[PDB]
């Protein structure tokens, strides 16, 4: 089990033969102005403390990433990985009015937008070249380079020295283990700008990106040295056929990883449209607590309860688990989250209305049982997911974080709370409904 670096004769040919959708643009091909702007933007976002270690979940374990991160991108866009939905700090894309940041921060976002445009152009060029090599559509290519977000990383290996050893090729210390990037548009490229501050095998003191073939530890892995401002590109199916990792050096290092996030169910607009659809079933002359529904058709109720779950667990809890970090950097999401929370509270109202109907004196049991069968999976999931999020929020690792990042379990209410129609813990309700469904016939 071994690896190759530029110091190996076989390196270049092995790069050609087993890893040709991996492209490398050395810092030289990038303008000094852009380097400067980008690097000052990294340092800027670092000074203002905008990068946070994520509290992710892997194989059922709550883990703090060694790396500090922040997501920057199109307004209203999210990127979900390791069960953790990141919300963009917005950059000023076309027809945008952010009005949300502290001067320097905004300028940094603008910069990473500029970086994004450049890397996009380079990715398009390289993908052209690749298709032309293949020769020996255009919309597809522009589509696979349309980076809508960048995920920024920082790590100081001197302050963060608790790093695993690369287990298969002897590549040494890993900042990030072997993985595929999730939640990307199919066959979409990833473009990385790497900014490192200042013998057998790979140089331990220099940062590398490592690549291997999926399922395969026989084919030697590649360890690519990254210096200051080097760029690399994972093109086409590389991210699917291969795995990559980050090999830490000794100095601090920043990176900007530009992605086409698969946000078809990952944007504010999308989840507001979903909420609007759920509340089509609600009589909406006035906003009060007397929620009354237009139909108890099972399909409509199932849909409603499914959307309720989606806005609660994919949006509100995800957002508040992060402890309102990035309020530091922008207030963009404050109103939208308030709005999604109000919509969700109304849906608590809807559920209550269904539970009210299910108990109604003159409701024929057949219709009742149709309703129960329609909503039960949703309520069961709501209960299990609430147990999970509550536990995730209270975990030992979670309580150790600063007060500026303390996982707020939200929304959360006590039974003594008369403002909420339904209890947080639905155990008894789900029991009753199941009991009802199995009554003698
Ligand atoms: O810095 C580099 O040169 C390489 N960056 C990443 O690979 C990277 N990968 C992920 C990532 C995305 C999706 C799923 C993952 C699963 C495990 C580890 C990283 C993952 C996140 C931030 C990153 O910076
Ligand atoms: Zn990755």
From Swiss-Prot:
Keywords assigned by UniProt, alphabetized: Acetylation, Cytoplasm, Dioxygenase, Disease variant, Iron, Metal-binding, Nucleus, Obesity, Oxidoreductase, Phosphoprotein, Transferase
Tissue: Ubiquitously expressed, with relatively high expression in adrenal glands and brain; especially in hypothalamus and pituitary. Highly expressed in highly expressed in acute myeloid leukemias (AML) with t(11;11)(q23;23) with KMT2A/MLL1 rearrangements, t(15;17)(q21;q21)/PML-RARA, FLT3-ITD, and/or NPM1 mutations.
Keyword Cytoplasm recorded: yes
A GO BP annotation: adipose tissue development
Cofactor: binding details: Binds 1 Fe(2+) ion per subunit.
Residues engaged in binding 2-oxoglutarate: 153, 232, 253-255, 257, 259
Activation and inhibition: Activated by ascorbate. Inhibited by N-oxalylglycine, fumarate and succinate. RNA N(6)-methyladenosine demethylase activity is inhibited by fluorescein derivatives. RNA N(6)-methyladenosine demethylase activity is selectively inhibited by meclofenamic acid; inhibition is specific to FTO and meclofenamic acid does not inhibit ALKBH5. Specifically inhibited by R-2-hydroxyglutarate (R-2HG), an oncometabolite that also exerts a broad antileukemic activity.
Annotated spans, Loop L1: 161-172
Cofactor requirement: Fe(2+)
One GO location term (cellular component): nuclear speck
Result of altering residue 69 to M/W: Almost abolishes enzyme activity
Catalyzed reactions: a 5'-end (N(7)-methyl 5'-triphosphoguanosine)-(N(6),2'-O-dimethyladenosine) in mRNA + 2-oxoglutarate + O2 = a 5'-end (N(7)-methyl 5'-triphosphoguanosine)-(2'-O-methyladenosine) in mRNA + formaldehyde + succinate + CO2; an N(6)-methyladenosine in mRNA + 2-oxoglutarate + O2 = an adenosine in mRNA + formaldehyde + succinate + CO2; N(6)-methyladenosine in U6 snRNA + 2-oxoglutarate + O2 = adenosine in U6 snRNA + formaldehyde + succinate + CO2; a 5'-end (N(7)-methyl 5'-triphosphoguanosine)-(N(6),2'-O-dimethyladenosine) in U6 snRNA + 2-oxoglutarate + O2 = a 5'-end (N(7)-methyl 5'-triphosphoguanosine)-(2'-O-methyladenosine) in U6 snRNA + formaldehyde + succinate + CO2
Positions of Fe cation binding: 179, 181, 244
Consequence when changing residue 182 to P: Abolishes enzyme activity. Abolishes ability to demethylate N(6)-methyladenosine RNAs (m6A) RNAs
Residue ranges, annotated region (Fe2OG dioxygenase domain): 5-264
Binding site for substrate: 69, 81, 179-182
EC number assigned by the record: 1.14.11.-, 1.14.11.53
Localisation per UniProt entry: Nucleus; Nucleus speckle; Cytoplasm
Influence of pH: Optimum pH is 5.5-6.
Annotated phenotype, changing residue 208 to P: Found in a patient with microcephaly, developmental delay, behavioral abnormalities, dysmorphic facial features, hypotonia and other various phenotypic abnormalities; uncertain significance
Modified residues (N6-acetyllysine): 164
Function of the molecule: RNA demethylase that mediates oxidative demethylation of different RNA species, such as mRNAs, tRNAs and snRNAs, and acts as a regulator of fat mass, adipogenesis and energy homeostasis. Specifically demethylates N(6)-methyladenosine (m6A) RNA, the most prevalent internal modification of messenger RNA (mRNA) in higher eukaryotes. M6A demethylation by FTO affects mRNA expression and stability. Also able to demethylate m6A in U6 small nuclear RNA (snRNA).
Annotated disease: Growth retardation, developmental delay, and facial dysmorphism: A severe polymalformation syndrome characterized by postnatal growth retardation, microcephaly, severe psychomotor delay, functional brain deficits and characteristic facial dysmorphism. In some patients, structural brain malformations, cardiac defects, genital anomalies, and cleft palate are observed. Early death occurs by the age of 3 years. Obesity: A condition characterized by an increase of body weight beyond the limitation of skeletal and physical requirements, as the result of excessive accumulation of body fat.
Comment block on domains: The 3D-structure of the Fe2OG dioxygenase domain is similar to that of the Fe2OG dioxygenase domain found in the bacterial DNA repair dioxygenase alkB and its mammalian orthologs, but sequence similarity is very low. As a consequence, the domain is not detected by protein signature databases.
Protein name: Alpha-ketoglutarate-dependent dioxygenase FTO
Gene: FTO
